[PDB]
Design a binder for this molecule. Structure first.
Ligand SMILES: *[C@@H]1O[C@H](CO)[C@@H](O[C@@H]2O[C@H](CO)[C@@H](O[C@@H]3O[C@H](CO)[C@@H](O)[C@H](O)[C@@H]3O)[C@H](O)[C@H]2NC(C)=O)[C@H](O)[C@H]1NC(C)=O
Ligand SMILES: *[C@@H]1O[C@H](CO)[C@@H](O)[C@H](O)[C@H]1NC(C)=O
Ligand SMILES: *[C@@H]1O[C@H](CO)[C@@H](O)[C@H](O)[C@H]1NC(C)=O
Ligand SMILES: *[C@@H]1O[C@H](CO)[C@@H](O)[C@H](O)[C@H]1NC(C)=O
Ligand SMILES: *[C@H]1O[C@H](CO)[C@@H](O)[C@H](O)[C@@H]1O
Ligand SMILES: *[C@H]1O[C@H](CO)[C@@H](O)[C@H](O)[C@@H]1O
Ligand SMILES: *[C@H]1O[C@H](CO)[C@@H](O)[C@H](O)[C@@H]1O
Ligand SMILES: *[C@H]1O[C@H](CO)[C@@H](O)[C@H](O)[C@@H]1O
Ligand SMILES: *[C@H]1O[C@H](CO)[C@@H](O)[C@H](O)[C@@H]1O
Ligand SMILES: *[C@H]1O[C@H](CO)[C@@H](O)[C@H](O)[C@@H]1O
Ligand SMILES: *[C@H]1O[C@H](CO)[C@@H](O)[C@H](O)[C@@H]1O
Ligand SMILES: *[C@H]1O[C@H](CO)[C@@H](O)[C@H](O)[C@@H]1O
Ligand SMILES: *[C@H]1O[C@H](CO)[C@@H](O)[C@H](O)[C@@H]1O
Ligand SMILES: *[C@H]1O[C@H](CO)[C@@H](O)[C@H](O)[C@@H]1O
Ligand SMILES: *[C@H]1O[C@H](CO)[C@@H](O)[C@H](O)[C@@H]1O
Ligand SMILES: *[C@H]1O[C@H](CO)[C@@H](O)[C@H](O)[C@@H]1O
Ligand SMILES: *[C@H]1O[C@H](CO)[C@@H](O)[C@H](O)[C@@H]1O
Ligand SMILES: *[C@H]1O[C@H](CO)[C@@H](O)[C@H](O)[C@@H]1O
Ligand SMILES: *[C@H]1O[C@H](CO)[C@@H](O)[C@H](O)[C@@H]1O
Ligand SMILES: *[C@H]1O[C@H](CO)[C@@H](O)[C@H](O)[C@@H]1O
Ligand SMILES: *[C@H]1O[C@H](CO)[C@@H](O)[C@H](O)[C@@H]1O
Ligand SMILES: *[C@H]1O[C@H](CO)[C@@H](O)[C@H](O)[C@@H]1O
Ligand SMILES: *[C@H]1O[C@H](CO)[C@@H](O)[C@H](O)[C@@H]1O
Ligand SMILES: *[C@H]1O[C@H](CO)[C@@H](O)[C@H](O)[C@@H]1O
Ligand SMILES: *[C@H]1O[C@H](CO)[C@@H](O)[C@H](O)[C@@H]1O
Ligand SMILES: *[C@H]1O[C@H](CO)[C@@H](O)[C@H](O)[C@@H]1O
Ligand SMILES: *[C@H]1O[C@H](CO)[C@@H](O)[C@H](O)[C@@H]1O
Ligand SMILES: *[C@H]1O[C@H](CO)[C@@H](O)[C@H](O)[C@@H]1O
Ligand SMILES: [Ca+2]
Ligand SMILES: [Ca+2]
Ligand SMILES: [Ca+2]
Ligand SMILES: [Ca+2]
Ligand SMILES: [Ca+2]
Ligand SMILES: [Ca+2]
Ligand SMILES: [Ca+2]
Ligand SMILES: [Ca+2]
Ligand SMILES: [Ca+2]
Ligand SMILES: [Ca+2]
Ligand SMILES: [Ca+2]
Ligand SMILES: [Ca+2]
Ligand SMILES: [Ca+2]
Ligand SMILES: [Ca+2]
Ligand SMILES: [Ca+2]
Ligand SMILES: [Ca+2]
Ligand SMILES: [Ca+2]
Ligand SMILES: [Ca+2]
Ligand SMILES: [Ca+2]
Ligand SMILES: [Ca+2]
Ligand SMILES: [Ca+2]
Lengths: 415, 415, 427, 425
């Protein structure tokens, strides 16, 4: 009972359907049978026709080689044996899988380029080129895939992160085997950037300025300040404070204060234009993070003048009644002769200190001419002897404000 | 020769296989033959057995029944006649056909519910219940199939259309017959919703406010506005204009304009802070569809102040060469004796109107003392006999803005 | 800002199975300057099948609203005009060409079918005319027809998709009465489509077979004096034909007998084929006789077959021996008184000669001595019958000797005839 | 101010196919005053799976980071702490529960497959053991197993997602030797997912068929005087069985002849079935005989079948006629004298009798005359054998006449027996 060959070899694709004849053993009254151990659950050997058949689906990942010992025996007890080595072939029927070994809690904004965000490995149950996989990262992300070792990868940053620009990212790792045809699978991880105090508060205006009218009730709003911080949380919350002033340090509390939460500037007293002209403060915005970032602005407050000071007369000296005595003016001079020079002042400024002398009353109209601005009282015409000796003048000093304030004086001039 | 019956009636499904025996005519050697006209291409009559078989597939849609006249003849002249009537039963072997007679060009979104959009009919080559056709539609789109008279249909609307939500629709009609088993066919049509000016323009900001520095060149851009419109075409093209202002209506053209195509606000004059401080304006954005829709926005323009106005000296009055004479100042004067107080104003605001008084030059340094803030020239010391009788004192008045504008004043002081 | 199209003429090629709702060409009229960007209004110009395609007047793209069909309409030509906010306008032409797809399977239409084919139909006889049609165009409409299986039929192509099913071999109904033939039509599209129709053909029978007798020659042996009108043997003829052409009829056409005798001796039942003897045969009269039988079918014309059967009659022991010489008196006695006393022993007294009309051992004669007054004085030849003297007679013997002889045959049981020889002496 | 959470425990339910990065929950702690609006900073407290969920310290919303899987972890627990700018704090607990989805289909595992099943195997034999596994839980792990086809198998479920492939009919290898069994498993979740595995089964042969002869009765004709050891005919028997149970062995068991003589008359070849003639048959010795043959297969238990074959020996003309009367001397002559010279016409001289041991044409005897001293004087019956006087004797004719008579048969070639008749007047 000779066999055609003493060793048979046959190559089977693992996707080979069940019930297909894989080998025919022909040596006519023979009976064939498995000798020794044979996976009879996978292959069937018809003892009459000598056909080996697959009874079940193959799987290269389960068992990849079989060795069958076939024994042929005739009607007489004649015997022969042969070996059939069935090699099954791998097919790319398994797709790659991604397993995330470690994922960072949060990545700080100031994490340098090259920091490792995530660790992950890949797997493919196939063998050879059907198991070699390529990991492509997807999208517009500041991330790069590094291969630490075979199927042990690293997700890392290669750019500089800025939470105020982009807070989060949707990274999707893709793994594609090099099999024919290829199979691929992907996973998606979300990454959030941790805030760091890398921005300092900045005031809306480089310098601030406000004019407030004098004679104001205290404890009221005079103006407001505001600072921006792109950071978030305690690193993006601003507080306002006064640190420096040209005023006496012990006297600053009496003038101004700042609401550290809102930034409105409170006046804590009734400003006086005549006592203090203006003052300069140094404001500071500041976050409550560690370390604390700050910014200083120069601010100035100019108190506006108001018509609250009546003019007062320096000369002549007034009796408590009001009159002044000048009883030696000579009749010898022609017009243009100055009798006296009235001088007054006003503690205000501008048109509130504009002095205009008016002849309010007189015992003789047209006798004395008074410079509206100079204050010199003169004789406008020649002295006629029909005029009386005793002459009473009543001058009024008025300021250029609206409404004006005035102060009157009596010039008793007799001849 | 006698038959069992004169007339035979059979029922054959149209899907009857070919070569199947239909009738067995028995009457003894006889010869059976077709008499008259008989579809010998469809049925075969064996002369010996008397059987009738189908030579070909049956089809109800072409022939519904056959009548064949068989004849039995003895060896002698004696013969007798028989008639066979074969009836074919209709089987559902035809699927329903959808034909679309008319399909609308465009349906405007303002079309009311129940408007006709498409016309289609259905046909079925079968017969009976195998030709009863039912039309079903997908429910996503707002369309309902209107069951018209007899296998005719209308596709109409059952909701409101909004092309700003969904501009188009895929519509899939599926017709199913009531045969057993049932057959079905489908068709797909695309419906586009037209645009109607049902949305109004929307300004990009709630209200506008821009700062314009004075002494600006005329014909320059100060700020730009934008208005959106989800409509498309002429219904979504915004045109800007100025509708009202707090200024004199005859002067509105002399101050600001707006480019209707771009929405930029042009300044038509050199703004002056000392004349007008700020002015508020109303803008209008409308689409060029008929009828049109519009929206109005508020925009306030603040004129920033610059140091363009020089401080004018009020008191005292100056000569053409800027001279002032205080000739009768007492020589026996106490330190701090108020020689005079200079009054000056500035038409600007803030730093540009913050006046300080300096001493530009003097005949005798240290003879007079001038306050920076109030500009009061006084005597620092008591006048010694070594001091001259006539003294020249050139003072200046400056403001705080950069660059400063100053007004000079030469002073003639005789004792 | 007047519009200009990229091309004056656009061309798009679409497969007919393109889904409804597919953007086919996004027209975008632009300005002559590259830096400037403009928006235009698009609209159909001339006559355009708006039921099939739609043109967005803002985005400018064309989209199909229904499923395309190459067999209904092959191409479209739609003109598009771009208009600005002003009145300036540009124009372009869009030609859409549908591409034929293999979406129709071949259709088989059996134009004419033969009523029936006789087995003697020559090779080249046409049995079926059919045509094939494919609604597709070009190669998706080119067809290949193939038959199915064993049947002796060949497809003969013709002019314009008309086909002929013809016979190539010779038909024999006794071999195969009918065939199931299935025609398959396949287009040379990628992928291809096929459709098949089955027809059934029955071969008609012609009387092409003459009956054959079961045996080349027939020989039957029957004993004589049989019962008349009884079966003696039976013949049978086979005919593979069917119907009237396979109906065998037997008859007697000739023999070596006289005509009237032939009717009285043998007959044959034409349906069964058995042959009957209408009289009791006699071996002494007739020894044997030759006959010729003919089997025929009932078709027109009839086909016959001749076979010669001859009958041999077997002999039985039905005739008793007859004594020819010497002559017998009604008593049964003969008288021979001329016997010489001086004759030597062994002298031939006389010889009894008998014959038998039978044959063989049934005519094989023996002569036995039934009785006698004197035993041992006469000895006869057992077969020759020569009764002569056995021993010389003493003078003391009686002058009158009586002999009683019997002649018998060799049959079972034997038959005999007796004779008395009276012999007296003288001088 | 103090933060207060709306609830001390939050419960959310997430399908396991929830995309990563979706907002699970937005925790918003608030101040107790309805009018007061405040904000707090949130943070994970205690143990928490920071890998699957992320918490924004400002918006206070928990969001998934990776994709969820019910088969791995079914629920998570989070301890969130809300704190204001001061030292006051509040805490709550979020219980996240994942809902199982039908994302895993059931797999078939053929535990054990029978090597081969004999066609006599009882109804209900177990051919295959297999189990079905589904990684899902709940009604997505309950599976219905149905096999396709007409095969005489049905699925008998076992205890715990173990299954048995058993028979429900009788098997017949001569009708169906193999089977393509396709098992389809379908879980009962919505939507359902199904799979299928195919196995092949071969039914073994059992000697259940007995051989049969090609003819019910056998009849054969052979001519006599044949050489010994010659093929006269051949018998053949078929066996639907295959192998040892389908190999026919021929033998002769019965016959009407003498049992000790049967061996010398006829034999049979056991392997081929040819019938050999063991001697030269004689038609005159035996006319016909009956054999009873037996075909048998070589299995346990062996099945047999007997057939009757009748052998008829056909007659050939091998025996010549023999002349009974008259007895002839070595001369081949017989003497009948003392014939009367005055013989009447038709006077019966003698009747010749002869026989032949053959049959039919070979035994049909005819009597002819080859030579004669005087033609026309004696007439011999062609069928009767009667030699008589044809004419009256003339005075010129001699008394001593001789007639050479031969007896012939109708065989091919014909045989004869001769005799010379000496007749004296
Ligand atoms: C009506 O149905 C048709 C077909 O079912 C729709 O056309 C298809 O629309 C989808 C989604 O817009 C397209 O997917 C896209 O494919 C392009 C290919 O370049 C790819 O770049 C995109 O990322 C996306 O995957 C699909 O291609 C398209 N089919 C064809 C043949 O163009 C149509 O949109 C439906 N119309 C309505 C109003 O529902
Ligand atoms: C043709 O097929 C039918 C059905 O398969 C069968 O009944 C018939 O006997 C067949 N005819 C021939 C001649 O084989
Ligand atoms: C089993 O199925 C295969 C594939 O369809 C087929 O080729 C084979 O003939 C089948 N085996 C049996 C015994 O039917
Ligand atoms: C054949 O004969 C033998 C013995 O005579 C007997 O055992 C056997 O059953 C018989 N077989 C048949 C089929 O009659
Ligand atoms: C190989 O040959 C065997 C014969 O037993 C078949 O069963 C099988 O399907 C393949 O054709
Ligand atoms: C990876 O790539 C394959 C083809 O190579 C796709 O089928 C799969 O969906 C994934 O995109
Ligand atoms: C990642 O991307 C693949 C395609 O590359 C998808 O199939 C998968 O679901 C995931 O979105
Ligand atoms: C405080 O509040 C007043 C209004 O009361 C403002 O005018 C001021 O600028 C500051 O914001
Ligand atoms: C100047 O004028 C005012 C106006 O009322 C007086 O009240 C004041 O006393 C002075 O005469
Ligand atoms: C000047 O005149 C006013 C009245 O106008 C007095 O009230 C004042 O005291 C002074 O005499
Ligand atoms: C009926 O009988 C006819 C002829 O007898 C067959 O050809 C046919 O297949 C059916 O069995
Ligand atoms: C239309 O509907 C029928 C059942 O009514 C289906 O069998 C067919 O495939 C189509 O979906
Ligand atoms: C429309 O829908 C039916 C099923 O309803 C399909 O069979 C057809 O091909 C088309 O897609
Ligand atoms: C007009 O143009 C100026 C620049 O000249 C812009 O700054 C302004 O906002 C507007 O767009
Ligand atoms: C007043 O002072 C300014 C300097 O601030 C000079 O530039 C000006 O000419 C005037 O003397
Ligand atoms: C003050 O001085 C300036 C020169 O600096 C003169 O131009 C002016 O008129 C005034 O006398
Ligand atoms: C082709 O592209 C256009 C772009 O507007 C779509 O409207 C159309 O449905 C198809 O996707
Ligand atoms: C003809 O060929 C097609 C494929 O080319 C088959 O699908 C069809 O059943 C027929 O065999
Ligand atoms: C043509 O198609 C029919 C139905 O598909 C088959 O029955 C036939 O055998 C041929 O393939
Ligand atoms: C008529 O019938 C006899 C039996 O009675 C047969 O022996 C004979 O051969 C013929 O068939
Ligand atoms: C001759 O002998 C036979 C017996 O063989 C008798 O039966 C007959 O009567 C005669 O005596
Ligand atoms: C011979 O003997 C028989 C009796 O056996 C007689 O019947 C005959 O007549 C002759 O005498
Ligand atoms: C839920 O809301 C968060 C923000 O609170 C988003 O980041 C997330 O993508 C989901 O929309
Ligand atoms: C199991 O069930 C699924 C769902 O019906 C099918 O898609 C599949 O082919 C198998 O029949
Ligand atoms: C069983 O069914 C599955 C689909 O349900 C197939 O993929 C498989 O090949 C077998 O036919
Ligand atoms: C033995 O051989 C003869 C011829 O050699 C055959 O006729 C006989 O049937 C047997 O096979
Ligand atoms: C009898 O006759 C035959 C011819 O039939 C001879 O061959 C033989 O020798 C004898 O004379
Ligand atoms: C008849 O003739 C033959 C010769 O043919 C002799 O052999 C025989 O003995 C008889 O005389
Ligand atoms: Ca694999
Ligand atoms: Ca793989
Ligand atoms: Ca930051
Ligand atoms: Ca900060
Ligand atoms: Ca004041
Ligand atoms: Ca004042
Ligand atoms: Ca229908
Ligand atoms: Ca129909
Ligand atoms: Ca609209
Ligand atoms: Ca609009
Ligand atoms: Ca100024
Ligand atoms: Ca086509
Ligand atoms: Ca085609
Ligand atoms: Ca015939
Ligand atoms: Ca007799
Ligand atoms: Ca699950
Ligand atoms: Ca499941
Ligand atoms: Ca068996
Ligand atoms: Ca057997
Ligand atoms: Ca013989
Ligand atoms: Ca002979």
């Amino acid at each position: 009972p000779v066999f055609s060959q003493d060793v048979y070899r046959v190559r089977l694709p693992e996707d080979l359907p069940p019930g297909t004849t894989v080998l025919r053993l022909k040596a006519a009254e023979f009976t064939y049978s498995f000798l020794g151990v044979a996976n009879k659950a996978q292959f069937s050997l018809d003892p009459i026709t000598g056909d080996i058949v697959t009874r079940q689906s193959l799987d290269f990942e389960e068992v990849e080689q079989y060795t069958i010992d076939v024994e042929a025996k005739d009607r007489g007890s004649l015997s022969s044996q042969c070996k059939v080595i069935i090699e099954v072939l791998d097919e790319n029927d398994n797709r790659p899988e991604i397993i995330i070994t470690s994922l960072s809690d949060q990545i700080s904004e100031d994490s340098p380029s090259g920091t490792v965000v995530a660790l992950f490995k890949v797997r493919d149950r196939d063998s050879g080129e059907n198991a070699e996989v390529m990991c492509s990262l997807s999208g517009n992300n500041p991330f790069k895939i590094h291969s630490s070792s075979n199927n042990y990868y690293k997700l890392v940053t290669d750019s500089i992160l800025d939470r105020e620009q982009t807070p989060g990212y949707n990274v999707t790792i893709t793994a594609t085997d090099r099999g024919k045809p290829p199979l691929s699978s992907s996973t998606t991880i979300t990454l959030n950037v941790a805030d760091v105090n890398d921005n300092a508060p900045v005031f809306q205006q480089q310098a601030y300025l406000i004019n407030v009218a004098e004679n104001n009730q205290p404890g009221t709003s005079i103006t407001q300040v505001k600072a921006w911080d792109p950071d978030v949380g305690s690193n993006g919350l601003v507080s306002y404070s006064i640190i420096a002033s040209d005023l006496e340090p012990k006297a600053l509390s009496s003038f101004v204060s700042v609401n550290q939460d809102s930034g409105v500037v409170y006046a804590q007293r009734a400003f006086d234009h005549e006592q203090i002209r203006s003052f300069q403060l140094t404001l500071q915005a500041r976050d409550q993070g560690s370390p604390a970032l700050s910014a200083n602005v120069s601010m100035r407050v100019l108190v506006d003048d108001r018509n609250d000071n009546a003019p007062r007369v320096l000369y002549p000296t007034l009796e408590p009644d009001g009159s002044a005595l000048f009883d030696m003016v000579p009749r010898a001079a022609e017009p243009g002769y100055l009798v006296t020079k009235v001088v007054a002042v006003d503690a205000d400024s501008g048109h509130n200190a504009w002095l205009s002398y008016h002849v309010l009353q007189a015992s003789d109209p047209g006798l004395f001419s008074l410079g509206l601005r100079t204050g010199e009282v003169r004789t406008a015409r020649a002295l006629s002897d029909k005029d009386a000796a005793r002459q009473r003048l009543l001058v009024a000093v008025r300021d250029g404000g609206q409404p004006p304030l005035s102060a009157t004086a009596t010039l008793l001039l007799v001849f």
